[PDB]
Design a binder for this molecule. Sequence first.
Ligand SMILES: Nc1nc2c(ncn2[C@@H]2O[C@H](COP(=O)(O)OP(=O)(O)OP(=O)(O)O)[C@@H](O)[C@H]2O)c(=O)[nH]1
Ligand SMILES: Nc1nc2c(ncn2[C@@H]2O[C@H](COP(=O)(O)OP(=O)(O)OP(=O)(O)O)[C@@H](O)[C@H]2O)c(=O)[nH]1
Lengths: 360, 360
Amino acid sequence: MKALILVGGYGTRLRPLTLSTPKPLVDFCNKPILLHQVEALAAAGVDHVILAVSYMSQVLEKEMKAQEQRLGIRISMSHEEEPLGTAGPLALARDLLSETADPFFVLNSDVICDFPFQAMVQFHRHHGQEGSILVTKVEEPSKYGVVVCEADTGRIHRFVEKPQVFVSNKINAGMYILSPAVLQRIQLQPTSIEKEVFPIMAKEGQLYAMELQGFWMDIGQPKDFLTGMCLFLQSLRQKQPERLCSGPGIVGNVLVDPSARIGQNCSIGPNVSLGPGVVVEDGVCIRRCTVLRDARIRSHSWLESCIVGWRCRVGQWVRMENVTVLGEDVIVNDELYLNGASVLPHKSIGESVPEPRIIM
Amino acid sequence: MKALILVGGYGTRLRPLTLSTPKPLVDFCNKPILLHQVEALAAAGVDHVILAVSYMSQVLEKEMKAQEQRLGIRISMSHEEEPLGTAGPLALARDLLSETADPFFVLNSDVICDFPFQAMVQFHRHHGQEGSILVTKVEEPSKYGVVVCEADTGRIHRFVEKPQVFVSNKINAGMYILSPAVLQRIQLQPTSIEKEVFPIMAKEGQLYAMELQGFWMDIGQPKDFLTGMCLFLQSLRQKQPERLCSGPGIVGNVLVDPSARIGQNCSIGPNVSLGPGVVVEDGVCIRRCTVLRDARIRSHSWLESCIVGWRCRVGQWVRMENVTVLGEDVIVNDELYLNGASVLPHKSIGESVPEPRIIM
Ligand SMILES: Nc1nc2c(ncn2[C@@H]2O[C@H](COP(=O)(O)OP(=O)(O)OP(=O)(O)O)[C@@H](O)[C@H]2O)c(=O)[nH]1
Ligand SMILES: Nc1nc2c(ncn2[C@@H]2O[C@H](COP(=O)(O)OP(=O)(O)OP(=O)(O)O)[C@@H](O)[C@H]2O)c(=O)[nH]1
């Protein structure tokens, strides 16, 4: 089959990371998140995948040209000269997806999940109407689309309202299957796929809901990046324990790259993704973190629940907490305390930041 | 001579330490505040000194009758059953200071100086008046009893405890030479030596001032305690340089007891004094701190401008800054941040203290 991934949206949440590297190329547990999605639907059964790019096209082109030989399936690219919103990917590549009269996958690159291509296409061949949505049960995650649905019929009869969610407590999961009739029902005007035109399809009775099995997160925000990282690590523990690194100086679930080395007397705590070539000196407690590629953490430093970017150097006796995110190649001077700091790339922090504050 | 040290009682400023060990007995740079006074009195040529106790005379008097035979001067004691303040024990010891027609030292128990007893008494007999006090220059004279000192002789023109209008700049250094005729003047009823005795003294022209050389501080507060140990280690750098332990990984002036040990890869930063019997683990950075007797600081901690009392166990990856005083036998758990924490005796801390608070 075929698959469309919307991969050019500027990533304005998750900003100190996406100011350098695009949003799906951001390393998510020693892999870009787009590589997770295209590997899942490489092994699933769509043999030709389109991804539509409007933002930093050249390095996405770099790793996509290096990647479609590496998968075996085709990586076609819907390039544009102007951002066409959430739905314009369907309209610019309308000439390529309409050639077959079969439905297709519309994927979103911020989602991390366990993907049901299987149950997606069997459920979509069951329900007989046009549109099919994944939907996940939530408590606070409402920012998404509220869906009012019944039982197994799953025919959506009422739709999206963002706040004060008294009717549903389950929301959208950013992964749909759509037939070609909607694919040429909508303009090439810049518009959203889930605000303007999905409401028409919920009014029309085309829209169905499939409840996802568990482990859903979207990593649009860095807090949600870290929670999705912990969720991905405990769902990686059950399936294959063979990949999680073990040790006396480690705790729980950790994902260290083979390039990355850990110094002795370290207590690498639970839920830590250490990227390629990262260097941890002697006596570093790191919990709930994700250190990305080639970043150095010096000795006697404490790190909890914080994202270290690409090639950042963190000094000695540094304490980082409250989801502090460092951008690309940031230097933290010695004996400082960062609580809440979002540091834009190529900065050299000289004083301790004890409260959440963007440092640019 | 005779020497009268009014030793305070209840030690409310500098409270977490004095809740276990009285203020004359808390070790300031590895020996107690009274011990600096009485070794300088034994070097001064004072024949026997008397200290005017009112609170916790068990441990205090047992220490004085220990070192009475070590200094070689009779460390006599004025017990009180209720506190008489600052001019009451002048009148309780009326007979025990009225026996000789010789002047006597009246010393605050909390001032730490580079005392000039010879200068003070042999400045005193040059004018022979009823009282000759020590004065020092300071930047905020509204906290301390100011004087008006004239040119080349030093008659106290006026004396007010809190000026509030800015009369002048010199202040009470907390050391006096009093003549026995001022003894019988005031009564046993408790009052202040500064409000009434000295302000009627200055009306006559019997109070005098001797300008100090420098390095005056009264250690009432823990902030004044740490500023005073900074200045005392400076005086040791000027005068007796071998007393300070400097080595390879030592930064600045450090005064270590011989019984105290320090691990490798640690940085014992400037103006630090380690008391007796402490044990310092590997990977710490201790700057501007005092660590009192037998306390433990575990690995990879960062301590700055803090007081760690007797038998405390500061855990691993622990940050402490901003005049955080620990009382006797306080256990800090692993990876906690204490900014400003005054911690009551026999407490176990299990949460971070992000703002200056009292923990009880
Ligand atoms: N090619 C392209 N992709 C887009 C465009 N707008 C949104 N997308 C993609 O749509 C997917 C989901 O959109 P969003 O969740 O709103 O993410 P976003 O566009 O990065 O915006 P923010 O979350 O506000 O930072 C993301 O993978 C985006 O890359 C666009 O104009 N062109
Ligand atoms: N013997 C004795 N000396 C006292 C007593 N009260 C005050 N003093 C002395 O009076 C002088 C001024 O007192 P402070 O500077 O306030 O020190 P403190 O008595 O410890 O009291 P705080 O620091 O305010 O809690 C100091 O030298 C004390 O030593 C007392 O009740 N008995």
